[PDB]
């Protein structure tokens, strides 16, 4: 299953929380964003986080999401 752990979800909240101007429905740039803007120890966890912030930003667009 591809259910995302609490850390991934939690951090995707926090990012959209404080960086909606900057960020996009694009993973790649959100990924690079996550670099110059946060500190994640491993490449994997980072795209894990970017991929899911990119999800959330893309569905925020069509109505809000609780959280």
């Amino acid at each position: 299953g591809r259910v995302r752990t609490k850390t991934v979800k939690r951090a995707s909240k926090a990012l959209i929380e404080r960086y909606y101007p900057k960020l996009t429905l694009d993973f790649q740039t959100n990924k690079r964003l996550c670099d110059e803007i946060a500190t994640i120890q491993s490449k994997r966890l980072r795209n894990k986080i970017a991929g899911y912030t990119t999800h959330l930003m893309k569905r925020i667009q069509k109505g809000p999401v609780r959280g």
Partner: protein, 223 residues
């Protein structure tokens, strides 16, 4: 001479293994810990990291002169092709091995069990540890076996950061009744990791934005 490279490094390892044993046996009442081995042009340089170095040096340098002679006469070095050095470990409150050796010396000195172990933690934690832990297995005063957990602070137990961040030690301490096992576990703060990763991989930090005072219809500056 003339040995294979595979067999050379394997061999090299065993040499250290024997050394660390022999010292651990000899320099217990001097808070021995590890042995950084260091071979050079000219020499091989064993550096003994104890805590009570004057009790390793001895009368104007006598006992280290023994230990060299020892380590020399056995591993068949030529006189002055191998040297020894005392080296006070940087704060013993984070070297499990030193902390284990304590509880041994503690318990062995008729110290209350909860007292020894609890204080051992209270000294490690006070030595700026991120967390620490003391198992006492074995059997005391009464026939049955029993064990205890003694832990304060924060530990981790799984994966690679184990390797990086937690010191482990076990030491059998042997009393009038039998033998009980001391196990010590220290968690070092990843913040001060020096030469390594500086956090748990677990960790995600977000840089904190900025109050923006927007507005201001266009305008330009010339230079």
């Amino acid at each position: 001479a003339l040995i294979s490279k595979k067999r050379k490094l394997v061999a090299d390892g065993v040499f250290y293994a024997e050394l660390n044993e022999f010292f651990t046996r000899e320099l217990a009442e001097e808070g021995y810990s590890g042995v950084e081995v260091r071979v050079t042009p000219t020499k091989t340089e064993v550096i003994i990291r104890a805590t009570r170095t004057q009790d390793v040096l001895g009368e104007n340098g006598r006992r280290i002169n023994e230990l060299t002679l020892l380590v020399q006469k056995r591993f068949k070095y030529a006189p002055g092709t191998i040297v020894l050095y005392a080296e006070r470990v940087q704060d013993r409150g984070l070297s499990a091995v030193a902390q284990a050796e304590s509880m041994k010396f503690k318990l062995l000195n008729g110290l209350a069990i909860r007292r020894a172990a609890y204080g051992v933690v209270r000294y490690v934690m006070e030595s700026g540890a991120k967390g620490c832990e003391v198992v006492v297995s074995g059997k005391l005063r009464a026939a049955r076996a029993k064990a205890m957990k003694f832990a304060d602070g924060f530990l981790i137990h799984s994966g690679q950061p184990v390797n990086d961040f937690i010191d482990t030690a076990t030491r059998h301490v042997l009393m009038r009744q039998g033998v009980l096992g001391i196990k010590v576990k220290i968690m070092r703060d990843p913040a001060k990791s020096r030469t390594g990763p500086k956090a748990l991989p677990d960790a995600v930090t977000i840089i904190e934005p900025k109050e923006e005072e927007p507005i201001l219809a266009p305008s330009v500056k010339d230079y």
